From Swiss-Prot:
Domain of life of the native organism: Eukaryota
Role: Receptor for extracellular adenine nucleotides such as ADP. In platelets, binding to ADP leads to mobilization of intracellular calcium ions via activation of phospholipase C, a change in platelet shape, and ultimately platelet aggregation.
UniProt GO MF annotations: A1 adenosine receptor binding; ADP binding; ATP binding; G protein-coupled ADP receptor activity; G protein-coupled ATP receptor activity; G protein-coupled purinergic nucleotide receptor activity; protein heterodimerization activity; scaffold protein binding
Extracellular side: 72-87, 150-175, 291-309
Subcellular location: Cell membrane
Residues annotated as glycosylated: N75, N158
Stretch of the intact protein here: 39 to 334 of 373
Protein name in the entry: P2Y purinoceptor 1
Length: 340
């Protein structure tokens, strides 16, 4: 059985530990602040707050495991924590990955319901968000539990201990099949669902006219309500046309800050960037690398497999970066921190 003599040193053995240190420092800080802010500076929690707290919980838990991984790279890739801790290290990475994707889908589906179908179902949205969150954690734990079988420690020829990121050669093909099932069900399907929600969010927002406020008095002109007292039909745009309150001209009017529109665009921008930079490259490369390891072990393919392996290492770092990028979403796409 021919095998491609893999030789990649001086790059990946510096990159991943540096990214892991960066993610630990920024991720522990941001998620500690977020978890502190939701628990002690938010009462009651809205629908999105429940999903955002769960996303922060998935990130902090994963961030908590990083020093072990950083140690492993600083210890010439020799795992000293045992078989069980290796399995738990790998399980948590995948639980964080898929839990994050599913909670991002929850936030996306929730904003679509708020933007398209807006009425005060405050407690109804909170109770449903808690129930959905529990189900999401149950789905993720169950679907990701095989990682506890596949992953584990292995003794190298030089007597060192590897903590397998995938699995042993005996279960590798089975692992690829399993990974394809989770890639399709917990990455591909949520991605199509997020895109649909975002397309419908952008469609609903672009089809509606913007409100204008007076800098002199503070009167808000609604395009749908209009101003029939002066001679403006309800439904007409601001450009189609004096202020009914104070009496100043149109020149003293500026566009109103819409909280739902701003939080929706921020979510659309941040999530799409995160899928384009982290989620999509990682899933493509994870798959490509397993495919090369299983089906492309011929001398003519070795050079290409090396490039795939190196590119995959890059995406592993990008995948981990989400843990320190996600807190930004709680302050730019989330509800204000208030205790009522
Ligand atoms: C309170 C938080 C927000 C501040 C973050 C503190 C950092 C300065 C700490 C936390 C994680 C630490 C790392 C955790 C793990 C390791 C692995 C450790 O590995 C070894 O000891 C193996 C050496 C060998 O056996 O050859 C070396 C220190 C290092 C890089 C640590 C250096 C200092 C770090 C980056
Ligand atoms: C039997 C086969 C066909 C199932 C395929 C597996 C997955 C494609 C399914 C199973 C569980 C599903 C998840 C179950 C629950 C949700 C919560 C849902 O969030 C809401 O309903 C938000 C409600 C709100 O707060 O307004 C968004 C989709 C999502 C992640 C689903 C996405 C698709 C998943 C991963
Ligand atoms: C308007 C549409 C076309 C933009 C779609 C946005 C994303 C879905 C794109 C932007 C960057 C793309 C990635 C750019 C680079 C690669 C590396 C590429 O790796 C290889 O070619 C392997 C061998 C090598 O490293 O040369 C595999 C596809 C992938 C992940 C691409 C998958 C699709 C991504 C994430
Ligand atoms: C977080 C637990 C559940 C222990 C864990 C599970 C699986 C794999 C690794 C793992 O964590 C560790 N295992 C062995 C050695 C180190 C760790 N992790 C660890 O030390 N995390 C840590 C987290 C926070 C922390 O406080 C600090 F941020 F530095 F202020 C100091 C250390
Ligand atoms: C009730 C809800 C949450 C559905 C959960 C279904 C779970 C139990 C399913 C979904 C995907 C499945 C895996 C898909 C592929 C493989 C590879 C095969 O070689 C061994 C079984 C294994 C590893 C499956 C075991 C069961 C599995 C983990
Ligand atoms: C709260 C604010 C959020 C802060 C967000 C943190 C900023 C992102 C950090 C680094 C970007 C990633 C750079 C990726 C560079 C990869 C290219 C590379 O050099 O990797 C090759 C390596 O040798 C392996 O083979
Ligand atoms: C909000 C506050 C801002 C926080 C921002 C701070 C983030 C630190 C950034 C880079 C540190 C990474 C250090 C680079 C360490 C490289 C690891 C290495 O040398 O590899 C180990 C090697 O394998 C052993 O032989
Ligand atoms: C109703 C709510 C139900 C919630 C469900 C809770 C499930 C917890 C999930 C993972 C923790 C288990 C971590 C398992 C760590 C692996 C250890 C192991 O199994 O040991 C391997 C081997 O035997 C040693 O050599
Ligand atoms: C709710 C309950 C949650 C489901 C619990 C464990 C899922 C099964 C994980 C075990 C994966 C075994 C992989 C396997 O069957 O592969 C062996 C095959 O012989 C290779 O060729
Ligand atoms: C209500 C639903 C609650 C269910 C929650 C799901 C949690 C599943 C727990 C373990 C997965 C089964 C995988 C078994 C992991 C043990 C490790 C193993 O399989 O051993 C491999 C090898 O022998 C050692 O090197
Ligand atoms: C929606 C967002 C758009 C999704 C973007 C890319 C999808 C993945 C397609 C990339 C598949 C890699 C191509 C491949 O399979 O070629 C590798 C093979 O080893 C050589 O023969
Ligand atoms: C139509 C709706 C599109 C939605 C799918 C979105 C992203 C697919 C990218 C993740 C899937 C993993 C890559 C696909 C793959 O299998 O190609 C690699 C190949 O196996 C190696 O030779
Ligand atoms: C609406 C806002 C959406 C914003 C849209 C943003 C588009 C993202 C573009 C590129 C990120 C993909 C990064 C892919 C990482 C591959 C790096 C690589 O090629 O690996 C190097 C390796 O060393 C060589 O062999
Ligand atoms: Zn006025």
């Amino acid at each position: 059985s021919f095998k491609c003599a893999l030789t990649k040193t001086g790059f990946q053995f510096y990159y991943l530990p540096a990214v892991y240190i960066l993610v630990f420092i920024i991720g522990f800080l941001g998620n500690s602040v977020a978890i502190w802010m939701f628990v002690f500076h938010m009462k009651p929690w809205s629908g999105i707050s429940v999903y955002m707290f769960n996303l922060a919980l998935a990130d902090f838990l994963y961030v908590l495991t990083l020093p072990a991984l950083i140690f492993y790279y600083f210890n010439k890739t020799d795992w000293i924590f045992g078989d069980a801790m290796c399995k738990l290290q790998r399980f948590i990475f995948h639980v964080n990955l898929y839990g994050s994707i599913l909670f991002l889908t929850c936030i996306s589906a929730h904003r679509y319901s708020g933007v398209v179908y807006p009425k005060s179902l405050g407690r109804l949205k909170k109770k449903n968000a808690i129930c959905i969150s529990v189900l999401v954690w149950l789905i993720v734990v169950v679907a990701i539990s095989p990682i506890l079988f596949y992953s584990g420690t292995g003794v190298r020829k030089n007597k060192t201990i590897t903590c397998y990121d995938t699995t042993s050669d005996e279960y590798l093909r089975s692992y690829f099949i399993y990974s394809m099932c989770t890639t399709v069900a917990m990455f591909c399907v949520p991605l199509v669902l997020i895109l649909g929600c975002y397309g419908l969010i952008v469609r609903a927002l672009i089809y509606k006219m913007k409100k204008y406020t007076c800098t002199v008095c503070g009167y808000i002109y609604n395009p749908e309500d209009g101003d029939p007292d002066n001679g403006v039909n309800p439904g007409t745009d601001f450009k189609d046309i004096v202020c009914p309150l104070c009496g100043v001209g149109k020149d003293q009017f500026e566009e109103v800050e819409e909280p739902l529109r701003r939080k929706s665009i921020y979510l659309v921008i941040i999530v799409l960037t995160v899928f384009a930079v982290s989620y999509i490259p990682f899933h493509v490369m994870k798959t490509m690398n397993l495919r090369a390891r299983l089906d492309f072990q011929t001398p003519a393919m070795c050079a290409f497999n090396d490039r795939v392996y190196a590119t995959y290492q890059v995406t592993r770092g990008l995948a981990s970066l989400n843990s320190c990028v996600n807190p930004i979403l709680y302050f730019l796409a989330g509800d204000t921190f208030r205790r009522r």
